[PDB]
A paper describes a structure:
L and P function as the RNA polymerase complex, responsible for replicating and transcribing the viral genome. To catalyze the RNA synthesis in both replication and transcription, L sequentially consists of five domains: the RNA-dependent RNA polymerase domain (RdRp), polyribonucleotidyl transferase domain (PRNTase), connector domain (CD), methyltransferase domain (MTase), and C-terminal domain (CTD). P harbors an oligomerization domain (POD) for self-oligomerization, and the oligomeric P attaches to RdRp of L, tethering the polymerase to NC to extract the RNA strand for both replication and transcription. Here, we resolved two L–P complex conformations from the mumps virus (MuV), a typical member of nsNSVs, via cryogenic-electron microscopy.
RdRp-PRNTase is quite conserved in structure amongst nsNSVs, while CD-MTase-CTD resembles an appendage of RdRp-PRNTase with great structural diversity. In MuV Lintegral–P, the appendage is also less resolved compared with the body. Different from the conserved RdRp-PRNTase, CD-MTase-CTD of MuV Lintegral–P adopts a spatial organization distinct from those of PIV-5, though their individual structures are pretty similar. The detailed alignment showed that MTase and CTD in MuV Lintegral–P appears as an integral on the PRNTase side instead of the RdRp side compared with PIV-5 L. The overall spatial organization of CD-MTase-CTD in MuV Lintegral–P is surprisingly similar to VSIV L. VSIV CD-MTase-CTD is highly flexible unless unphosphorylated P locks their configuration, while in MuV, no P fragment is resolved around the appendage. In MuV Lintegral–P, an α-helix hinge termed Hinge-1 (L1416–1431) connecting PRNTase and CD has been visualized. It is supposed to provide flexibility to CD positioning via loops flanking it. Compared with PIV-5, the spatial organization of MuV CD-MTase-CTD renders the helices α53 (L1439–1458) and α57 (L1535–1544) of CD rotating upward and leaves more space for RNA to access MTase. Actually, MuV Lintegral–P forms a continuous positively-charged tunnel from the GDN to the K-D-K-E motifs, ideal for the RNA synthesis followed by 5’ capping and methylation, which is favorable as the transcription state.
Author numbering: 1434 to 1459, 1478 to 1604, 1609 to 1657, 1663 to 1685, 1688 to 1711, 1736 to 1745, 1772 to 1920, 1929 to 2113, ...
């Protein structure tokens, strides 16, 4: 104690703080310790400690295989109250620890437009799951992990080594059936000790495997969580801080016109964390790359995740970039002061090159200043204060590109319009996220823009939704604008709108409709073919643009499930999963006949796990079940019976006392049919279809 070298203190501090976290879950926080230790080791030892705690429970449930342990720990973490995990949530939510976790691939910020909106409880659960997977893999390969016994200088150490031995038996329960340990003394773990040498026979370099069995690593500590001494030694030591710092340091169906449905189109978006509007941007680049917009600043109104901002910046770089999106500090996680930062732009190439100081393509380092002083009304463009502040900071006649993507005149749209009119450099470009379906609004917008813009081009993105009549306006600020003011343009636009025909010629409307019907049909056939055939490589240039922009397939971190090479093994996996995790459900159901809420949450967790199993292994499904899963998801629900049938569940799962009695089988079939079907929100549907696209693209 206290005599180990400095190189050994940091992993020991990580082990001790991980033990503290695990005891906490099974204002208090651990940022002080985690900022001065190995955060990846912290989560690895957290997984190790949680595995030690759950070893006996998983052994008495006859869990087999690494994935069985992973599913059990996932549901255990998902079933704890959110107040209990707030200790780990607070540590992860800290900006330094958050960036550390992101950079060590432990944490990926997904499904949140802003960092402050991230589900840090789910984020902590994901980190602990990653640590558990790392521990299981390292144990399987033979990397033994030290067990610490604080407050011991007995029998509890013999129990702890028994927990580790039972974990090891559980890992290889497929090859050989583990013996019973129920109702047995902590000393009689020698039976398990003996059978692990038998299991070791059935595979390479066994020396490390056997060493962790016969000679378990153990380290008893007379003091108790000891961690404070290690933390003080690390902080005081100069090298220690030096060591910590060193450790942590093609779709061409788009067309241009120069002047309540399932989100199936997201499958064609197989890249990107959170929003993926760069896909709608790709078609814009094909027309705006010819002209010059790099000079001058760029302004992005309501950009949100900043995906379009990133992909515009990589190929069209600006000197100053003024992000702007709606955000209030009220939705921050406790004890955090997160600014509105686009969680997709921060991990992209432009911000990664800004932070490390490398120059951009133009040779001028991009200066990224979000428009945020602390007022929620300031982020909301409908307020006049927002307009005045935005115009103040960017400066009138300072920028050349303005990207307005405000979703569907409303006060915010006209406010965004005269922000641009005031701030664009003469000859500057505006890209606008219009909408053709309310044609009156379209005529109004076209007239007001035409008063002071020239070369107004209407472009429908080939990657946009085929049902929303979306149009991306491509217009240039007219040189030498002699327009009196914005209000005259607006009032006069009202006149034309209420006194005469719309400025759009009927021939252009007919052309738009004629190209729109064929484009929608073609895109729908492309989506249908991609979902059905599941060809791995389709439209490589578009996704290559995303990869150059800094986008990566986010299915790796959201879908950590394995990729079975056979469909029979897939079905067998849920045959184990359902039969293992419905035991509690049946137990409480028989006990009561409060509990119904637990029943429902366990059922929902099981069905969601089955859903992600299906999505991860979507490619290897036969086309018939692929088709029926697509049909089920289209109405917005995930029926469990399509993937696997109750007779298959009974056949492909080990025989047990559960699922053995006529009443038990009857209630299993009752809970097995439509009564366990779950519903999916629209954002959930986009998540699922994007994940399917990612799986197809990567497999």
């Amino acid at each position: 104690l206290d005599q180990i070298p400095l190189l050994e203190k940091i992993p020991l501090l990580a082990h001790l703080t991980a033990k503290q976290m695990v005891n906490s879950i099974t204002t208090s926080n651990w940022i002080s310790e985690c900022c001065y230790t190995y955060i990846d080791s912290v989560f690895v030892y957290s997984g190790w400690a949680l595995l030690l705690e759950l070893s006996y429970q998983m052994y008495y449930l006859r869990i087999q295989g690494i994935q069985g342990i992973l599913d059990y720990v996932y549901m255990t973490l998902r079933r704890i109250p959110g107040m209990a995990i707030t200790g780990i949530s607070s540590t992860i939510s800290h900006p330094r620890i958050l960036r550390r976790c992101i950079n060590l691939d432990v944490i990926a910020p997904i499904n949140s437009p802003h960092i402050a909106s991230l589900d840090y409880t789910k984020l902590s659960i994901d980190a602990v799951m990653w640590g558990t997977k790392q521990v299981l893999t390292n144990i399987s390969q033979g990397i033994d992990y030290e067990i610490v016994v604080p407050s011991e200088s007995s029998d509890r150490v013999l129990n702890l080594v028994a927990r580790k031995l039972s974990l090891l038996a559980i890992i290889w329960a497929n090859y050989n059936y583990p013996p019973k340990v129920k109702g047995m003394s902590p000393e009689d773990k020698c039976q398990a000790l003996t059978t692990h040498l038998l299991q070791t026979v059935e595979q390479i370099e066994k020396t490390n495997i056997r060493r962790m069995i016969i000679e378990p690593k153990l380290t008893a500590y007379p003091s108790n969580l000891l961690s404070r001494k290690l933390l003080n030694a690390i902080r005081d030591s100069e090298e220690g801080q030096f060591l910590i710092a060193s450790y942590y340091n093609l779709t061409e169906f788009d067309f241009i016109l120069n002047l309540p449905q399932p989100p199936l189109h997201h499958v064609l978006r197989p890249l990107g964390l959170s929003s993926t509007s760069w896909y709608k941007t790709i078609s814009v680049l094909n027309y705006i790359s010819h002209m010059k917009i790099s000079d001058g600043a760029h302004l992005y109104l309501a950009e949100g995740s900043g995906a379009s901002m990133s992909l515009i910046e990589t190929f069209l770089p600006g000197e100053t970039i003024w992000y702007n999106s709606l955000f209030n500090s009220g939705e921050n996680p406790p004890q955090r002061n997160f600014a509105p930062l686009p969680t997709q732009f921060i991990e992209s190439v432009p911000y990664r090159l800004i932070q490390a100081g490398i120059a951009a393509g133009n040779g001028i380092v991009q200066s990224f200043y979000p428009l945020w002083n602390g007022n929620s009304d300031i982020t909301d463009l409908s307020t006049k204060t927002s307009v005045e502040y935005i115009i103040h900071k960017v400066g009138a006649d300072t920028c050349a590109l303005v990207h307005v993507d405000l979703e569907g005149l409303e006060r915010a749209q006209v406010h965004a319009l005269l922000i641009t009119v005031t701030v664009l450099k003469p000859g500057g470009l505006l890209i606008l996220k219009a909408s053709w379906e309310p044609f009156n609004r379209f005529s109004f917008l076209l007239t007001v823009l035409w008063q002071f813009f020239s070369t107004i081009r209407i472009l429908r993105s080939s990657y946009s939704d085929p049902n929303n009549h979306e149009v991306y306006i491509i217009a240039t600020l007219a040189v030498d604008p002699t327009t009196s003011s914005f209000t005259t343009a607006l009032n006069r636009a009202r006149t034309l709108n209420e006194q005469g025909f719309s400025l759009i010629p009927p021939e252009l409307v007919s052309e738009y409709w004629r190209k729109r019907v064929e484009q929608g049909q073609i895109i729908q056939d492309c989506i249908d073919k991609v979902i059905s055939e599941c060809v791995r490589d389709q439209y490589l240039a578009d996704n290559n643009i995303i990869l150059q922009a800094g986008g990566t397939p986010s299915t790796r971190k959201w879908l950590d499930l394995p990729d079975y090479s056979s469909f029979n093994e897939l079905q067998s996996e849920m045959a184990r999963l359902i039969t293992i995790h419905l035991k509690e459900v049946i137990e409480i159901l028989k006990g009561q006949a409060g509990p119904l809420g637990k029943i429902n949450t366990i059922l929902r967790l099981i069905v969601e796990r089955i859903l992600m199993y299906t999505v991860r292994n979507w490619c290897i499904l036969p086309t018939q079940t692929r088709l029926t899963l697509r049909q089920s998801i289209e109405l917005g629900e995930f029926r469990l019976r399509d993937v696997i049938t109750p007779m298959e569940i009974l056949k492909l799962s080990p025989n047990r006392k559960y699922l053995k009695s006529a009443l038990n089988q009857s209630t299993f079939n009752h809970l097995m049919g439509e009564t366990s079907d779950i519903l999916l929100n629209r954002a959930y549907q986009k998540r699922i279809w994007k994940a399917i696209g990612c799986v197809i693209y990567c497999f």
